[PDB]
Amino acid sequence: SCLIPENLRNPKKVHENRLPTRAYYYDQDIFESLNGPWAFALFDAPLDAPDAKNLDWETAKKWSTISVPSHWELQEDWKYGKPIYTNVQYPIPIDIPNPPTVNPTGVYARTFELDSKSIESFEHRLRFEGVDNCYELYVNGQYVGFNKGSRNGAEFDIQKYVSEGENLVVVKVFKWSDSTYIEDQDQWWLSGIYRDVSLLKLPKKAHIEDVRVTTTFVDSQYQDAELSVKVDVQGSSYDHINFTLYEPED
Amino acid sequence: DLNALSADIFSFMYPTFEIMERWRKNHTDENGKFEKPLILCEYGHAMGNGPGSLKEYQELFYKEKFYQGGFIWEWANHGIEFEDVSTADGKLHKAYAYGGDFKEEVHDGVFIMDGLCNSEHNPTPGLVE
Amino acid sequence: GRGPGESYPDKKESQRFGLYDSKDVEEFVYDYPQENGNHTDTHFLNIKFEGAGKLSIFQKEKPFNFKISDEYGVDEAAHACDVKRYGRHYLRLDHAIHGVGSEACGPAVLDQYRLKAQDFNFEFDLAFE
Amino acid sequence: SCLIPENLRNPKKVHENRLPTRAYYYDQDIFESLNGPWAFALFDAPLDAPDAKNLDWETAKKWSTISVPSHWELQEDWKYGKPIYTNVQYPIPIDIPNPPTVNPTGVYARTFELDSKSIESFEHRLRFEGVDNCYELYVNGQYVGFNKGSRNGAEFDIQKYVSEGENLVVVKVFKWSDSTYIEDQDQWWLSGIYRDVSLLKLPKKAHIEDVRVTTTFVDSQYQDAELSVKVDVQGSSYDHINFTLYEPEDGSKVYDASSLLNEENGNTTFSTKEFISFSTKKNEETAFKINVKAPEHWTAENPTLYKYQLDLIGSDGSVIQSIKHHVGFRQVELKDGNITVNGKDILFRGVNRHDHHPRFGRAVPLDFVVRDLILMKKFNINAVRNSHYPNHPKVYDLFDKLGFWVIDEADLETHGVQEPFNRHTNLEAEYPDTKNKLYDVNAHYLSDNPEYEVAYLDRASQLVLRDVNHPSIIIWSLGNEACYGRNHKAMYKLIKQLDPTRLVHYEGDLNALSADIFSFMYPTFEIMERWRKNHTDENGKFEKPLILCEYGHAMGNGPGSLKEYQELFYKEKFYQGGFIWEWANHGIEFEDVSTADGKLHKAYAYGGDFKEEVHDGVFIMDGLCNSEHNPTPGLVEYKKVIEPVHIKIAHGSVTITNKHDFITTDHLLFIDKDTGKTIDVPSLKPEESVTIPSDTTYVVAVLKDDAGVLKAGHEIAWGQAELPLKVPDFVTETAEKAAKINDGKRYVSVESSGLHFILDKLLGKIESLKVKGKEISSKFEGSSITFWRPPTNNDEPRDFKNWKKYNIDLMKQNIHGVSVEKGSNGSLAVVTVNSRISPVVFYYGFETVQKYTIFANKINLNTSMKLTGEYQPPDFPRVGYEFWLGDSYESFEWLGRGPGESYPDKKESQRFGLYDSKDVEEFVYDYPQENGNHTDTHFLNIKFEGAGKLSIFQKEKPFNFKISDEYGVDEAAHACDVKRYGRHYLRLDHAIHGVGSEACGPAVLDQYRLKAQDFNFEFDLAFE
Ligand SMILES: OC[C@H]1O[C@@H](O)[C@H](O)[C@@H](O)[C@H]1O
Ligand SMILES: OC[C@H]1O[C@@H](O)[C@H](O)[C@@H](O)[C@H]1O
Ligand SMILES: [Mg+2]
Ligand SMILES: [Mg+2]
Ligand SMILES: [Mn+2]
Ligand SMILES: [Mn+2]
Ligand code: NA
Ligand code: NA
Ligand code: NA
Ligand code: NA
Ligand code: NA
Ligand code: NA
Ligand code: NA
Ligand code: NA
């Protein structure tokens, strides 16, 4: 079935190059928002979509814009189709793990600016809070990776692909995939980058990757407790960690 | 996972009292001990005028230690705002869409409109009850 | 009777007893038009006429049910805007009414709330001020 | 007067310890938000309020909370009172400068945490973006200061009072003060901390306090420009400053709510595309001037901005502080008697905008302001007037980026001083050329009062200094309706001193003795024209131009005659356009008991609804948009008349004229709507035109690509060829069919195959007309031809008075004779009705002849009406028939103007086409009034379920119609009060009175008035 791309019909291809999942923490100093208007075009199926390895900003620049985050079935004048409601029944034929060959494909593009010092100071990532159904990601005409799981997040290391000045982000989003079979909630079928997109700037030489906090009572009488804090630090250039717990607020 | 072979909790959706009660008795031993409790992950389907008999479910919750309550399906109608031609008027009006309104090949109609709150996320008599 | 909102045999206990005025109440609009606006366990009903006092209505020995509206075509109405309205109001004065249940997905109206087929006997007074 | 505190009754006590005003810049790293829940208590008057020098957090902690920012008259269950609406009249007694002794006092309290290091690292301030009316401020039980000026901001140094750990902020807010007298805008009276509160943390040893950016063209040819940057640094511990200017982003930039509101900086790399750099040297002036090579002009039509970064740099070479903002290269001049931007004499396509939200009042979320502005751009607006005070400081960037010509106005209205005078002297009308003499007599109380000079100057100083770096602001305004006096001259001197780069406006200064512009509100054309001629010399030169700071009062159904104003704007160089009053109705959401229902409904409140002692009723409901800030037919009409491209189709030609000020037509796609194929239109500059030969009837000018906040395909302008009235080719059945005719005692009956016609001879009433399964009958109360409409807001002051006086609503038809004869030229029967149509109690009326010619499938109705009798009314609201439609009635369709309502002096935005009732959302007025008329109707089709259609048309002339089920509109105060019948009716009218703007402004113009005269018209009722 070569008229439908391999990654859309492979249940094991859950992601390509996605960073391991970590506990979520929003930090104003690290999270830069990439929400706003993006260049966007819709295509009948993947084969009509441009090869992102050759897509310039000069070319994409000329497309209509859509605002991120939003669903593409919920636009002014229903420009890109309408919502579909199914409870149980799949809105596609069942031929596991194949999606239909006719498979609405949305391509998103925008740019962001990077400093001379920024690339020296920070490890750069892209974080997508939710994209339905799945997508491939390109930076500066280069393939970064792939992802499935519509209501899960995803982070990707961008450091290798990044340049001083203008940077190009292109996201190819597909409506159906092998994943559709396991996403059949009794709800509206809706597509697109429907959650936040962020550029993360983490300190380069060393930074906090993951944290784990548990509270366990030592006792049958639920009084004294053990507070356990486990931190996974990434990189060598650090000395130690401090922890300060504050008086409670009722 | 009905028998919780790989879960820590028993869970039913929309059961009758008879069905809740049989389950309890089959999982309470001679001592009065049970190994796992029952929750209703979904009950009292809140579609339209209703749900009825939330009272009788609650009586059951308070009465037995085996029952630890439940979660109503659902918080709010999934209506989407759109423009509908009125059957009464011949004119265009703001309305809330469910299956069929966006002219789907296949759809499940009003089944998306099953909340304690309406499409605009405001309380219905269901939530008041 | 029960208020300020609607009440039904198996969905009424949140509506406490009191004296209620139609003017103080925002009538609830369902997203999908259906049976609404009944008041159960009504002790007495006063209907006010401009410059002519009131008409008091009560049922002997047992509280009653009522609805006052100008609406029709609710069955066929797909959305709120599809609901037709008469040029005058009507009183729906009921001895009894079927419960509401959760049968769209779940148990039927429980036995003690079903309006079962049987003989009916009831007396009303229409008392004019 | 010791029972009222000194500071509340002292006009000179404008503030205590307030820091000097500086240019506003939001910085995420410096601004910490103190918004959220605060402890709050309300007190009857100041003397009941606690001494803040002794108030603990432990004590305040126990109070109820209110959320900041919000008004205290807009709380859950109206906990702390209700809003009060006054237009002119003060809601207090006048005893300048004393407020009432009973003076609602709200005390606010919250805490914030301070670090050990924070006090070492930073100078700490408190900034309040707006508090109504005035307040004293305490930190840690210590008095910090005092402030007045409700829509101005204020900063206070907090460093001395601050402690490590828990800090206590207490704010005592008073509703009335000496300041109230100068804050009497036509709006809701609302109180409290209604805008943001922030804790500022500035770097301690040295920091950027103020910045000043000007762009001046070196040249008569508006090419090279001098960019001047002056920075005021506070403290010694810095080396120099750096400035980086970046390559421009064209004004056609795409924006949305999300990107406009994005506030992120710090680690975000501002821009990379460097255009120019500059550095100061150690120990030298922290200011500079640089020559810029032919920069991209900023304009409202193309708001091109150059981003910049300003860095304060320490001895070690590190960045102490940054400011990231933008430069707009533009210059405003009074040149050859015109307001000129970049050499060009511009046109204001403007609107007055208050801060208003239907639930939050003047505490408008930015999200909602963006909503307003996007909508304005979508309806061809290019200018905004900040009536009548500055907005939230963050709004001005939106103007810069979206492109609006902005009049930023001082928070100063004195109107209330006039009211007793108006009443004492029984004053009926004010006129723009003459009215300033009425304000002159009361000026001494405030605007000519030397005790108020400091306050007036402060409103001016605060206005300018906060907003001085926004290229979109081209005019400073001294306030609104504050008479004229020495204080205004003082304001003018100060502003020119502080900001030489802009022009000064003040409408109350008729002769612009201390203003740079002439300004009228609601003038007639005669009045505009006289002024022009008296200020144009023999050479054709004028010294200053005229704008209309307010015109075309948009209250309710209206405004009428925007067309005739616009013709004047384009015709004379002396007129530079104007601003509609107002952007949106000020309705507040509330729960109203329905007059139709006896039940509770959501409605929008105006004066009287919150049961005020004194109020000004519906006068708050005067917007182009409704209370929910959505377009009314007023806005739809405005977009058309101000369209920046003219498209005229006549004589096999399309003439297209570019009516922009700066941009070409190149971004527009011109479509021939008859074929759907584009017309190749050359690039047209401002004022250039082209004639293209074409067979077309209908041409549209639309956006090629997404630009600004507009989408590809958005309609900017359009034109149509005039459509002749074509008689539809309906075929009348003239075949000889026998007909049963019964001329009874009272009722006349005509029965044939597929036909049943019954007329009541006593009344002139069609009891029933049933042709081929379709039924109509007369909607009859008194007369078969009626004249009444539910009065518009514009009808209320005069026309309604007249119509009511002449009993037009009580017109009666008195039948004299009915003639019945057999058909002749193919007709079945002729029924002729002779009557007088005349109201009770009056002589005047119409000798009327109604001739019904009945065919098998058609009814011809010829109406002759001859006006007779002494003491006649000047005009009528309308004249026509009312029919009940049968139960089968389902929808309608018409050839004419649409999709929405149209009236004689408000119709040109509704283009000709075939329209279906089903495709149209009928507009609901906030205040129920005349609506839903369709003028210039060629024909009307009424569809009946399973019985085809009834086609209606008028001979030789287009007609008017409305189809509804509504009644009781006259008495209905709110939408929910409107009554509805169990069936629909057709209002079929020969003619209809215009709409005008007389609630405030000119009467319906003569050619739009339905003048009293004879009427003669023929209708066909053709049944399928
Ligand atoms: O309202 C019907 C509901 O039925 C439940 O069984 C299901 O878990 C829900 O997702 C929803 O489909
Ligand atoms: O709607 C009446 C309006 O009248 C104008 O004279 C005034 O400037 C406006 O602020 C408003 O009062
Ligand atoms: Mg399901
Ligand atoms: Mg005023
Ligand atoms: Mn509908
Ligand atoms: Mn009302
Ligand atoms: Na589904
Ligand atoms: Na339990
Ligand atoms: Na459902
Ligand atoms: Na229905
Ligand atoms: Na006022
Ligand atoms: Na002009
Ligand atoms: Na007003
Ligand atoms: Na009215």
Domain boundaries, chain D: 1-204, 205-330, 331-642, 643-731, 732-1024
Compute the distance between CA of residue D623 and CA of residue D121 in angstroms, rounded to an integer: 50
> What letter represents residue A147's amino acid?
N
**Sign of torsion over alpha carbons D213, D219, D220, D222:** negative
Nearest to A133 by CA among A145, A146, A149: A149
Residues of chain C with Cβ-Cβ distance to D602 below 8 Å are 26
Compute the distance between CA of residue C91 and CA of residue C126 in angstroms, rounded to an integer: 12
Domain D732-1024: CATH class, spelled out: mainly beta
What is the CA(D578)–ligand 14 centre distance, in A?
Answer: 30
Same topology between domain D205-330 and domain D643-731: yes
Residues of chain B with Cβ-Cβ distance to D891 below 8 Å are 90
List C-alpha distances in Å: D10 to D15, D100, D325, D495: 10, 13, 39, 24
**Closest ligand to Cα B73:** 1
Compute the distance between CA of residue A66 and CA of residue D607 in angstroms, rounded to an integer: 42
Q: Would you tell me which CATH number, out of the four given (3.20.20.80, 3.40.50.2020, 3.30.70.1070, 3.40.47.10), belongs to the domain D331-642?
A: 3.20.20.80
Minimal-distance CA residue to ligand 2 atom 3: D186
Cβ-based burial of B87 (10 A; exposed 0-12, middle 13-18, buried ≥19): middle
Report the residue from B50, B87, B101 with minimal CB separation from C76: B87
Compute the distance between CA of residue D391 and CA of residue D470 in angstroms, rounded to an integer: 13
List C-alpha distances in Å: A18 to A128, A147, A173, A234: 11, 7, 16, 17
Nearest to D385 by CA among D472, D482, D493, D257: D472
What is the CA(D1001)–ligand 13 centre distance, in A?
Answer: 12
Q: Return the exposure string of C87-107: e unless at least 16 CB atoms fall within 10 Å of the residue's CB, then b.
A: eeeeeebbeebebbbbebbbb
CB of residue B73 inside a 6 A radius of ligand 1 = yes
**Sign of torsion over alpha carbons D199, D203, D205, D210:** negative
The verdict on domain A1-204 having CATH code 3.40.1650.10 is: no
CA B104 remoteness from chain centre: 25
Kindly compute the dihedral angle of the four CA atoms of residues C103, C107, C112, C114, in this order, to the nearest 10 degrees.
20
Which of D597, D602, D921, D922 is the best residue to mutate to test the C interface, defined by the most C CB atoms within 10 Å of its own CB?
D597
Q: Which two tokens stand for residue D58?
A: 């432990």
What does the DSSP assignment read for D202-254?
EESSEEEEEEEEEEEESSTTS-SEEEEEEEEEEES---EEEEEEE--B-TT-B
Chain B residue set in contact with D, beta carbons under 8 Å: 83, 85, 89-94
Nearest to D481 by CA among D428, D512, D443: D443
> Across the A/D interface, how many CB contacts are shorter than 8 Å?
53
Q: Which two tokens stand for residue D282?
A: 């150690």
Ligand 2 neighbours, Cβ below 6 Å, are D 87, 186, 387, 480-481, 521, 550, 581, 619, 622, 1000
> What letter represents residue D771's amino acid?
V
- Residue D495 — φ and ψ, nearest 5°? -65, -50
Question: What is the nearest CA distance from D702 to chain A, expressed in angstroms?
Answer: 15
Residues 6+ apart with CB under 8 A from D559: D552, D553, D580, D634, D637, D794, D906, D995, D996, D997, D1001
With an 8 Å Cβ cutoff, are B44 and C8 in contact? Answer: no
Chain D residue set in contact with B, beta carbons under 8 Å: 890-892, 917-922, 943
With an 8 Å Cβ cutoff, are B91 and D890 in contact? Answer: no
Residues of chain C with Cβ-Cβ distance to B96 below 8 Å are 31, 79
How many other C-beta atoms lie within 10 A of the C-beta of residue D862? Answer: 15
Which chains share 3+ C-beta pairs under 8 angstroms with B? Answer: A, C, D
Residues of chain D with Cβ-Cβ distance to A33 below 8 Å are 262, 264
Minimal-distance CA residue to ligand 1 atom 12: A186
Q: What is the DSSP letter of A151?
A: T
Q: Are C114 and B65 in contact (CB under 8 A)?
A: no
Residues 6+ apart with CB under 8 A from D268: A32
What does the DSSP assignment read for D855-911?
-SSEEEEEEEEEEESSS--SB-SEEEEEEEEPTTEEEEEEEEE-SS--BTTB-TTS-
- B42 an active-site residue? yes
Establish whether chain B is in contact with chain C, requiring a minimum of 3 CB pairs below 8 angstroms.
yes
With an 8 Å Cβ cutoff, are C8 and B56 in contact? Answer: no
**Sign of torsion over alpha carbons D346, D350, D352, D357:** negative
What is the CATH number assigned to the segment(s) D643-731?
Answer: 2.60.40.10
Across D489-624, the runs of DSSP E, i.e. the strands, are: 503-505, 518-521, 546-551, 575-580, 588-593, 600-605
What is the CATH number assigned to the segment(s) D205-330?
Answer: 2.60.40.10
Q: Which residues pair with B93 in a beta bridge?
A: B84
Q: Are D858 and D1022 in contact (CB under 8 A)?
A: yes
With an 8 Å Cβ cutoff, are D917 and B94 in contact? Answer: no
> What letter represents residue D906's amino acid?
K
What is the CA(D432)–ligand 12 centre distance, in A?
Answer: 19
Question: What is the nearest CA distance from D77 to chain C, expressed in angstroms?
Answer: 14
How many other C-beta atoms lie within 10 A of the C-beta of residue D753? Answer: 11
Task: Name the closest residue on chain C to residue D979, using Cα atoms.
Answer: C87
CA D411 remoteness from chain centre: 19
What does the DSSP assignment read for D792-809?
PTTTTTTHHHHHHHTTGG
Compute the distance between CA of residue D730 and CA of residue D727 in angstroms, rounded to an integer: 8
> What letter represents residue D703's amino acid?
L
List C-alpha distances in Å: D240 to D194, D286, D493: 39, 7, 34
Q: Are D188 and D71 in contact (CB under 8 A)?
A: no
Compute the distance between CA of residue C20 and CA of residue C22 in angstroms, rounded to an integer: 7
Chain D residue set in contact with C, beta carbons under 8 Å: 591, 593, 598-602, 965, 980-983
Nearest to D696 by CA among D650, D739, D731, D663: D650
The one catalytic residue among D481, D582, D966, D998: D481
Compute the distance between CA of residue D781 and CA of residue D775 in angstroms, rounded to an integer: 19
List C-alpha distances in Å: A45 to A8, A65, A100, A183, D381: 12, 20, 9, 20, 41
Compute the distance between CA of residue D371 and CA of residue D368 in angstroms, rounded to an integer: 5
**Sign of torsion over alpha carbons D543, D545, D549, D551:** positive
Omega into D693 within 30° of 0, i.e. cis?
Answer: no
Cβ-based burial of D276 (10 A; exposed 0-12, middle 13-18, buried ≥19): middle
The one catalytic residue among D183, D453, D550, D643: D550
Cβ-based burial of D987 (10 A; exposed 0-12, middle 13-18, buried ≥19): buried
Q: How many CA atoms lie within 13 A of A118 on its CB side?
A: 27
What is the CA(B54)–ligand 10 centre distance, in A?
Answer: 24
Crossing angle for the helix pair D366-378 and D395-402, to the nearest 10 degrees: 30
Establish whether chain C is in contact with chain A, requiring a minimum of 3 CB pairs below 8 angstroms.
no
With an 8 Å Cβ cutoff, are C81 and B77 in contact? Answer: no
- Residue D816 — φ and ψ, nearest 5°? -105, -50
Across D368-412, the runs of DSSP E, i.e. the strands, are: 383-385, 405-409
Compute the distance between CA of residue D1004 and CA of residue D1006 in angstroms, rounded to an integer: 6
Q: Return the exposure string of D295-331: e unless at least 16 CB atoms fall within 10 Å of the residue's CB, then b.
A: bbbbbbbbbbbbbbbbbbbbeeeeebbbbbbbbbbbb
How many other C-beta atoms lie within 10 A of the C-beta of residue D261? Answer: 18
Q: What is the 3-state secondary structure (H, E, C) of D650-706?
A: ECCEEEEEECCCCCCCCCEEEEECCCCCEECCCCCCCCCEEEEECCCCEEEEEECCC
Q: What is the 3-state secondary structure (H, E, C) of D982-1015?
A: EEEEEEEEEEECCCCCHHHCCCCCHHHCCECCCE
What is the CA(D206)–ligand 2 centre distance, in A?
Answer: 47
Cβ-based burial of A189 (10 A; exposed 0-12, middle 13-18, buried ≥19): buried
First to last CA, chain B: 31
Residues of chain A with Cβ-Cβ distance to B103 below 8 Å are 82
Which chains share 3+ C-beta pairs under 8 angstroms with C? Answer: B, D
Q: Which residues pair with A89 in a beta bridge?
A: none
Which of B13, B47, B49, B117 is the best residue to mutate to test the C interface, defined by the most C CB atoms within 10 Å of its own CB?
B49
**Sign of torsion over alpha carbons D55, D56, D62, D68:** positive
Residues of chain D with Cβ-Cβ distance to B118 below 8 Å are none
What is the CA(D604)–ligand 14 centre distance, in A?
Answer: 13
Report the residue from D266, D272, D706 with minimal CB separation from A165: D272
Give the pairing type, strands D332-335 and D678-679.
unpaired
Minimal-distance CA residue to ligand 2 atom 10: D186
Chain A residue set in contact with D, beta carbons under 8 Å: 28-30, 32-33, 35-37, 62, 64-65, 67-68, 76, 113-115, 118, 122, 164-166, 201
CB of residue B57 inside a 6 A radius of ligand 1 = no
Q: What is the 3-state secondary structure (H, E, C) of D475-517?
A: EEECCECCCCCHHHHHHHHHHHHHCCCCEEECCCCCCCCCCCC
In the three-class reduction of DSSP (H, G, I as helix; E, B as strand; rest coil), residue D368 is classed as: helix
Crossing angle for the helix pair B17-27 and B54-63, to the nearest 10 degrees: 20
The one catalytic residue among B42, B59, B104, B120: B42
